[PDB]
Amino acid sequence: HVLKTKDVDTVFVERQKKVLSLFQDVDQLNTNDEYYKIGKDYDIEANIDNYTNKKAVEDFLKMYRCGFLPKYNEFSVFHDKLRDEAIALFHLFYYAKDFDTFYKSAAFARVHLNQGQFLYAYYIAIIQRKDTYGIVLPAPYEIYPELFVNIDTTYKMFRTKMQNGLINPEAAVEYGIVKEDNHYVYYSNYSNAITYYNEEQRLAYFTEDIGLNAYYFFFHIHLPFWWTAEKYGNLKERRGEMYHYFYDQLLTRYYFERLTNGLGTIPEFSWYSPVKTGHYPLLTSYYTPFSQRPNFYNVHSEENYEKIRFLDAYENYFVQALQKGVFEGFGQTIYLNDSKANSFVGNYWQDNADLYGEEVTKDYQRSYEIVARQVLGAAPKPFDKYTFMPSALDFYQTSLRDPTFYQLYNRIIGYFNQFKQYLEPHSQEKLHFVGVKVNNVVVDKLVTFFEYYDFDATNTVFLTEEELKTKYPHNLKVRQPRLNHQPFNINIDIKADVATDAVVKIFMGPKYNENGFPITLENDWMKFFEMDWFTHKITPGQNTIVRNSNEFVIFKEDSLPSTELYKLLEKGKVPFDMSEDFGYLPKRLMLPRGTKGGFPFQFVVFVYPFESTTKNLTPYEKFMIDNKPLGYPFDRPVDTSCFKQPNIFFRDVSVYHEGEYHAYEYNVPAYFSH
């Protein structure tokens, strides 16, 4: 298995080395590095002429003169002042006229501002600036190891650094600390191996997967809720569509994990009754432990009365709109069938900038998602504007760790899917592909298994004044068994009458509901996970297509450590997926953990006429090369018909699991010591 690579010129390579120079030992400053002197003395005001938007820069300065979040404090975009500062910072980076000005702005920021706040604006700037297009971003778990690994392993790294190596390596082995080459390897268990407070803990290997959590973080920075979608042209008009698609797919993939673990549908809750499934974040900030929500949390308390009425009202508005058939307010009147309706409900539920036709959201435009994450997070009200006790719901890089996160968005998509039933359902005629039939589909054996994976967690530790004079060590490694599956082929047999350009799509859906009974398309259309999307020319007669799972366009390869990036740059190359598909879901997680006996699911291949690509979303996600609504043909319900279309085929499939079933078994000392 070789990793696909991409060629880049020298200018790119130089910029790449520059951006990465600001991603090292992030919680510490290195006066021996070039960026320090540059950032320390940089004069924004003096160079105001090197920014394309002066007002934006003057606002950053007016704001910066009043002080920003101090260093070491936790930064979160869900907190007003913190967000407003980050956005102003983003504008400073985004409006830089050229890479040079941008780099100096970033250098200035790294030196003078809070580490988290800078990293947040920096990551986004790199994604939005045209001149940095394609520049590879380091894996989020590499930059924020303290948000991707439980404290028990973070403290082990702290111990090692304080002792300056292992004092008794034979002993350290028993606690998962091993020395390989010049690296210190730490086997890190998911939380279910240390605390089992509720049945949801059985999903810890998935909900805590560093790839899965990185994926949500990337979803955010690719296009923040607080920013207009303007930059991506067409994406603006189709924003609500992308909102629905991202979440429905995420909720579905998560539901599949619940299914093979016998956990049923995503639980429903009430703002007026105790929230049943708690969560204990085994994470910590520099000032406090993350807030915990115990099982059966009494959410309806004095501290939340008003917030709960706001959330309830936000919901009533949407339910009442659906009932009277029209959305009123926000400067318009949209009937459910309006062509702008879909984006309106998505922008409404997210409370993003495009809902207001502005470029950035304001403080007073209260967000349903923000307040919900607030009361579900269970943290006491913030001490002040710069100080708060964080919860897993306060970060895009830790959200998928909390069960209520899926419960909250499932509630939101619940409303979205209700909206979908008022739309014109796909008719049988429109779904029918004349002259094209799928005679058969064969799927190789589906098998999952856990496989060790390492990532550089050196940012966890602080360096010595002497160490800062030499090259960064990239010394520590975190090792964890991560979900994976064996590659598999899907054989598609198509009998055609005439020759045409077709689009073939591949989905995975459940076979049975939570009670073990047959699925029903009328009620389960929203439970189909899109796995592949590609064009193919069909010739009259027999057509045989063979797609390997490794070719599925929806997924990406695992990120590489920043160190391996450097070696690849020496050859004028960068990892292909890491460069253009950083926001895709890791292909190793495309299949939910199976069972020893094999768990039932079903694949479905749908092929339709390839036509208009006038409003595609290629600038955002490469695989969105069509005019069809995202998720087609399962983007909305379909005109019920107990009679299948010839151009669609369902195949029963079973997902088995090899090796040890529990991930923690691979972290048992007696095992990894062989």
Ligand X SMILES: *[C@@H]1O[C@H](CO)[C@@H](O[C@@H]2O[C@H](CO)[C@@H](O[C@@H]3O[C@H](CO[C@H]4O[C@H](CO[C@H]5O[C@H](CO)[C@@H](O)[C@H](O)[C@@H]5O[C@H]5O[C@H](CO)[C@@H](O)[C@H](O)[C@@H]5O)[C@@H](O)[C@H](O[C@H]5O[C@H](CO)[C@@H](O)[C@H](O)[C@@H]5O[C@H]5O[C@H](CO)[C@@H](O)[C@H](O)[C@@H]5O)[C@@H]4O)[C@@H](O)[C@H](O[C@H]4O[C@H](CO)[C@@H](O)[C@H](O)[C@@H]4O[C@H]4O[C@H](CO)[C@@H](O)[C@H](O)[C@@H]4O[C@H]4O[C@H](CO)[C@@H](O)[C@H](O[C@H]5O[C@H](CO)[C@@H](O)[C@H](O)[C@H]5O)[C@@H]4O)[C@@H]3O)[C@H](O)[C@H]2NC(C)=O)[C@H](O)[C@H]1NC(C)=O
Ligand Y SMILES: *[C@@H]1O[C@H](CO)[C@@H](O[C@@H]2O[C@H](CO)[C@@H](O)[C@H](O)[C@H]2NC(C)=O)[C@H](O)[C@H]1NC(C)=O
Q: For binding to ligand X (CB under 6 A), which residues are involved?
A: 40, 67-68, 70-71, 111-112, 168, 170-171, 174, 176, 187, 189, 193, 386, 664, 667-670
Min dist. Cβ of residue 32 to a second copy (A): 11
Min dist. Cβ of residue 239 to ligand Y (A): 16
Query: Is 291 a residue that touches a second copy (CB under 8 A)?
Result: yes
The first and second tokens of residue 488, run together, are 């598999």
Min dist. Cβ of residue 234 to ligand Y (A): 20
For helices 341-350 and 305-324, give the axis angle rounded to 10 degrees: 170
Cα–Cα dist 98/9, whole Å: 18
Query: Is 526 a residue that touches a second copy (CB under 8 A)?
Result: no
Question: Which of ligand Y, a second copy, ligand X, none binds 40 (CB below 5-8 Å, type-dependent)?
Answer: ligand X
Q: Which is nearer to ligand X, 97 or 179 (CB)?
A: 179
Min dist. Cβ of residue 171 to ligand X (A): 4
Q: What is the CA 591 to chain-centroid distance, rounded?
A: 17
Q: Which is nearer to a second copy, 163 or 265 (CB)?
A: 163
Question: Which of a second copy, ligand Y, ligand X, none binds 68 (CB below 5-8 Å, type-dependent)?
Answer: ligand X
Structural contact between residues 386 and 67, judged by C-beta atoms closer than 8 angstroms: no
Query: Is 295 a residue that touches a second copy (CB under 8 A)?
Result: yes
Min dist. Cβ of residue 358 to ligand Y (A): 4
For 417-439, b/e burial (b = at least 16 CB within 10 A) is: bebbeeeeebeeeebebebbbbe
Min dist. Cβ of residue 599 to ligand X (A): 23
User: Under rule CB under 8 A, which residues in 60-99 are in contact with a second copy?
Assistant: 70, 72
Question: Which of ligand X, ligand Y, a second copy, none binds 667 (CB below 5-8 Å, type-dependent)?
Answer: ligand X
* Helix, strand, coil percentages in the chain from 3-state DSSP, rounded to 5: 40, 20, 40
Q: Which is nearer to a second copy, 330 or 383 (CB)?
A: 383
For 520-546, b/e burial (b = at least 16 CB within 10 A) is: ebeebbbbbbbbbbbeeebeeeebebe
Cα–Cα dist 351/367, whole Å: 5
Binding mask 486-515 for ligand Y (x = CB under 6 A): ------------------------------
**Residue 174 CB burial class (10 angstroms; 0-12, 13-18, ≥19):** exposed
Min dist. Cβ of residue 291 to a second copy (A): 7
Q: Token pair 């004092």 is at which residue?
A: 167
Cα–Cα dist 266/411, whole Å: 9
Q: DSSP secondary structure string, 609-673?
A: E----TT--TTT-TT--SSSPTTTTSSS-B---SS--TTEEEEEEEEEE-S-SSGGGGG-HHHHT
- What are the C-alpha distances in Å from 484 to residues 400, 453, 512? 19, 10, 24
Q: Which is nearer to ligand X, 68 or 419 (CB)?
A: 68
Phi and psi at residue 516, to the nearest 5°: 85, 10
Min dist. Cβ of residue 187 to ligand X (A): 4
User: Under rule CB under 6 A, which residues in 323-342 are in contact with ligand Y?
Assistant: 331
Min dist. Cβ of residue 45 to a second copy (A): 24
The first and second tokens of residue 340, run together, are 């702008």
Min dist. Cβ of residue 189 to ligand X (A): 4
Min dist. Cβ of residue 649 to ligand Y (A): 48
Q: Which is nearer to a second copy, 228 or 292 (CB)?
A: 292
Question: Which of ligand Y, ligand X, a second copy, none binds 176 (CB below 5-8 Å, type-dependent)?
Answer: ligand X
Select from 490, 407, 415 the least CA-distant residue to 445: 490
Select from 404, 379, 398, 399 the least CA-distant residue to 389: 379
Choose the stretch contacting a second copy; rule: CB under 8 A; options: 108-116, 161-169, 346-354, 592-600: 161-169
Q: Which is nearer to ligand Y, 228 or 645 (CB)?
A: 228
Closest residue (Cβ) to ligand X?
Answer: 67
Question: Which of ligand X, ligand Y, a second copy, none binds 358 (CB below 5-8 Å, type-dependent)?
Answer: ligand Y
The DSSP code for 271 is T
Alpha helices in 95-139 (DSSP H): 99-112, 115-128
Q: Which is nearer to ligand X, 110 or 373 (CB)?
A: 110
Question: Which of ligand Y, ligand X, a second copy, none binds 440 (CB below 5-8 Å, type-dependent)?
Answer: none
Cα–Cα dist 546/489, whole Å: 7
Choose the stretch contacting a second copy; rule: CB under 8 A; options: 155-163, 531-539, 555-563, 629-637: 155-163
User: Under rule CB under 6 A, which residues in 351-410 are in contact with ligand Y?
Assistant: 357-358
Cα–Cα dist 211/214, whole Å: 5
Cα–Cα dist 505/296, whole Å: 42
Query: Is 524 a residue that touches ligand Y (CB under 6 A)?
Result: no
User: Under rule CB under 8 A, which residues in 177-206 are in contact with a second copy?
Assistant: 194-198
**Total residues found in the chain within this entry:** 674
Q: How many CB atoms lie within 10 A of CB 262?
A: 11
Phi and psi at residue 172, to the nearest 5°: -55, -30
Q: How many CB atoms lie within 10 A of CB 273?
A: 11
Q: Which is nearer to ligand X, 348 or 453 (CB)?
A: 453
Q: DSSP secondary structure string, 330-375?
A: TTEEEETTSTTHHHHHHHHHHT-HHHHTSSB--TTS--HHHHHHHH
For residue 68, the surrounding DSSP H or E stretch is none
Binds a second copy by CB under 8 A, chosen from 6, 129, 159, 202:
159
Choose the stretch contacting a second copy; rule: CB under 8 A; options: 1-9, 357-365, 377-385, 527-535: 377-385
Choose the stretch contacting a second copy; rule: CB under 8 A; options: 287-295, 323-331, 479-487, 560-568: 287-295
- What are the C-alpha distances in Å from 127 to residues 218, 231, 253, 481, 562? 10, 11, 26, 30, 17
Q: DSSP secondary structure string, 543-555?
A: EEEEEEGGG-TTE
Choose the stretch contacting a second copy; rule: CB under 8 A; options: 105-113, 160-168, 428-436, 491-499: 160-168
Q: Which is nearer to a second copy, 293 or 505 (CB)?
A: 293
User: Under rule CB under 8 A, which residues in 27-46 are in contact with a second copy?
Assistant: 28-29
Query: Is 387 a residue that touches a second copy (CB under 8 A)?
Result: yes
Min dist. Cβ of residue 66 to a second copy (A): 18
Choose the stretch contacting a second copy; rule: CB under 8 A; options: 131-139, 227-235, 382-390, 488-496: 382-390
Cα–Cα dist 299/375, whole Å: 7
Binds a second copy by CB under 8 A, chosen from 233, 294, 414, 473:
294
Q: How far apart are the first and last CA of the chain?
A: 26
Question: Which of a second copy, ligand Y, ligand X, none binds 189 (CB below 5-8 Å, type-dependent)?
Answer: ligand X
Positions in the binding site for ligand Y (CB under 6 A): 331, 357-358
Positions in the binding site for a second copy (CB under 8 A): 28-29, 70, 72, 151-152, 155, 158-159, 161-165, 167-168, 174-175, 194-198, 274, 278, 280-284, 286-298, 301-303, 378, 380-381, 383, 387, 389, 461-466, 468
